[PDB]
Each structure stands twice: as structure tokens, then as C-alpha cells.
């Protein structure tokens, strides 16, 4: 009775299909999952994808001549829309095929089994709003520490903790812990819940999605917050959902120190370059040696079979002299996540974790032998050291 017939602007269409196509699976056991769902009605077109784990859905303006729904190959539609000329795109469902016309280019794709296509999950009740940029930044700063699929499930996720208008993101891989606290706007009072989101999915949603100024997080309301089984993210005309992890996150807080025996403040860029130079001779990028004394940092690394490098930097150091080694890659990951012009290190023992956090004027107001109370910060990158011979 009704077959979708719609006219669209190329940019809106190609961009929408592009964003939705990122959540598409490759060679899924369920063929229909490889399709993109197009639903045109009133004066808009909705473009959707789903893989039983992540859902992507975006609505764009559209000139509807006939509403309807159709399921077409996702990657193929994405490629076509990329390659279309900057002209109006006419889409018309005809029988078992879908005509797509743009200028002189004409495509005829076969329709997929929209009957066997699963229903998209409905986002839980809205829980709060978060500034888009800050949310994406926090995610980026924490995801660096998340474990990869090789490790246990609990480590492959970003823990999202909400307590009123303050939320904390945490991720660890058993060697580095990243924690970021930020302020948000809760649409429910005195909420207190914690969930575990797949780190890859959340980081992806941050990099590619999260358009606009504010982002609405949907985990539920009242007591059902976080118990709905999925995280919803709505921003502008985009909405996505992610299945949550059932695994329980480690009690990461009892890894953080209360005081430091030594403190060291230095410029992020300077330290990063020096680390990148010295690390070129580490046997497997495995170990860089840091020697703090007076106000000097002696970096070193290497073997006699590969080579031996070293470099001295000026450092604002206070406390007991220290010699501690780290993984060069892990170290540069932390420094890269700080997003500060200057870093402060908090040390206890060469065999215990080190605290990497942005520097503050208070740090420059220290001149005692220690110990030093662990200051409160918005972001912390705790890095476990490497044993020394």
C-alpha cells in the first residue's frame, strides 16, 4: 500500500549514513544486521543500524512523497552516498528493489528482509545532561587505560559512576588506572548508581558522535537507574544505545595513595619528547629509567645489544631522591591524557604506583622533605612501575 519515496539533500544523507554505518557489523551471522534501516514519514527520514550490542539512529530532513520502511545493505549504501554528486538524492522503493538517483547516477539495490530485522532498543528514561565536549574529553582521558579484548571482561570497560551532579569515569588494565571526575546536570535528585560500559563503544561514540552542546545520558530514573541493561546517549537528532557489561569493576579506589614520599613537576611536552627519544633503544619499548635527584631528571634506557640512551631534564623535585622505571608507552599515554601544560608526579616507592596529574600552583608551594598529602584533582593517571635489576 505504501513504499518509501523520498528526496534528500546529499550532505545530510551521506553524513547520516556515514555515522550510522560505523556501528555496523562486518559479516554478521544474522544477515539482516548488515543492513541499514530507512524509515521515511511526515517530513523526515530516520536511518538506523543495530548489532544486538550497539544501536545508532539519526533523523534528517526529507521530502516525503510516500512514507515507508526499507532495509538496504549498509556498507554499500555508505559507499554510494560517499560517491554521489552534490545533487538531490531521490530514493524510491519499487517492488523488491530500491532505486537511488542523483544527477546522472542511478543505482538499483535489492531490498533485505526487513521482516526479520530486530527492533531497536528504546532508550531508558533520561538521567541527566553533560556538556558534549567535556564528556568526550573525559572519555578520551580514561579510555587510554582500558584493557583490550584479550584481558578479562571487567577490564574492557569504562566504569561510569554517578552521585548527584558529580560523575566519575574509571578504567584500568591492571597496569594503569585512569579516573576522571566531572560535573553534570542530573534530571533526577540525589541519584547514586554505577554502570560498566564497553570502553571501545563509548570511546567510539565520543570520537565520532556527541554532536551539539549538551548530551543527554539515559540510564533510567528513580531506583531503576542503571538496571535497564543499556546506556542511551541522545544529542541533537542522534541517539545511540550500548549494552552494558555485567562484570563487576575492581575497587580501583584502594589503589590510590594517600600521601607521597616524593613529588616532581615538569612540562608535559618536554618530558614527552625526551621519553620518545630515549625509548628508541628499549629492547621492546619495555622499560625507561627515571632518576630524580636535586632538581634534575636523568632519563635512561637501552641495552648493549641495541643501544643505550640517556637525557637530563630540569625538574621541580621535592622529597627523597628516587629511581623508578616505567613502560615508555604507558608513560606517554598518561602524559597525553593529562591535557595540561605541566604535569606533577606523586611517588612513594620504586615498586608502587605513581600518580600523574595536572600541575597546580599549590604544587609549586612545597619545599619540605615530605611526606606530601595526595592532593585532590579532576583527573588522575596511576601508573604501575617496572622492576629494576
Amino acid at each position: 500500500l505504501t513504499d518509501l519515496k523520498v528526496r534528500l539533500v546529499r550532505d545530510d544523507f551521506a553524513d547520516a549514513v556515514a555515522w550510522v554505518a560505523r556501528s555496523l557489523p562486518s559479516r554478521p551471522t544474522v544477515p539482516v544486521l548488515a543492513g541499514v534501516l530507512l524509515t521515511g514519514s511526515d517530513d523526515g527520514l530516520t536511518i538506523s543500524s543495530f548489532d544486538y550490542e550497539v544501536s545508532a539512529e539519526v533523523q534528517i530532513p526529507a521530502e516525503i512523497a510516500a512514507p515507508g520502511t526499507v532495509l538496504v545493505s549498509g556498507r554499500l549504501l555508505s559507499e554510494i552516498t560517499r560517491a554521489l554528486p552534490n545533487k538531490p538524492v531521490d530514493l524510491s522503493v519499487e517492488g523488491t528493489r530500491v532505486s537511488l538517483t542523483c544527477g546522472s547516477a542511478r543505482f538499483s539495490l535489492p531490498t533485505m528482509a526487513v521482516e526479520d530485522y530486530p527492533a531497536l532498543p528504546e532508550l531508558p528514561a533520561e538521567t541527566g545532561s553533560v556538556p558534549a565536549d567535556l564528556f568526550a574529553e573525559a572519555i578520551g582521558q580514561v579510555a587510554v587505560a582500558a584493557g583490550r579484548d584479550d584481558t578479562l571482561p571487567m577490564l574492557t570497560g569504562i566504569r561510569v559512576e554517578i552521585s548527584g551532579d558529580r560523575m566519575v569515569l574509571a578504567a584500568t588494565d591492571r597496569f594503569r588506572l585512569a579516573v576522571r571526575e566531572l560535573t553534570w546536570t542530573t534530571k533526577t535528585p540525589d541519584v547514586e548508581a554505577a554502570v560498566l560500559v564497553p570502553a571501545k563503544t563509548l570511546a567510539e561514540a565520543a570520537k565520532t558522535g556527541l554532536d551539539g552542546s549538551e548530551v543527554q545520558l539515559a540510564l533510567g530514573a528513580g531506583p531503576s537507574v542503571g538496571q535497564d541493561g543499556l546506556l542511551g546517549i541522545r544529542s541533537e537528532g542522534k541517539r545511540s544505545t550500548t549494552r552494558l557489561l555485567d562484570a563487576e569493576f575492581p575497587k580501583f579506589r584502594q589503589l590510590l595513595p594517600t600521601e607521597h614520599t616524593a613529588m616532581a613537576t615538569i612540562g608535559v611536552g618536554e618530558l614527552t619528547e625526551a621519553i620518545k627519544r630515549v625509548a628508541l633503544v628499549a629492547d621492546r619499548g619495555a622499560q625507561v629509567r627515571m632518576e630524580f635527584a636535586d632538581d634534575v631528571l636523568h632519563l635512561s634506557a637501552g641495552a648493549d645489544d641495541v643501544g643505550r640512551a640517556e637525557e637530563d631534564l630540569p625538574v621541580s623535585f621535592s622529597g627523597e631522591p628516587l629511581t623508578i622505571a616505567f613502560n615508555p608507552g604507558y608513560l606517554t599515554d598518561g602524559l597525553g591524557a593529562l591535557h595540561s601544560e605541566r604535569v606533577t608526579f606523586g611517588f612513594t616507592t620504586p615498586s608502587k604506583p605513581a600518580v600523574l596529574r595536572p600541575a597546580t600552583e599549590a604544587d609549586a608551594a612545597l619545599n619540605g622533605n615530605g611526606p606530601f598529602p595526595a592532593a585532590e584533582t579532576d583527573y588522575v593517571y596511576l601508573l604501575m612501575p617496572v622492576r629494576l635489576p
Binding site: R174, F175, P250, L255, A286, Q287, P353
Partner: peptide, 6 residues
Amino acid sequence: QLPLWG
């Protein structure tokens, strides 16, 4: 390399 826990 040492672990944070375990």
C-alpha cells in the same frame, strides 16, 4: 613490569 594488583 609490576601489576597494580594480583
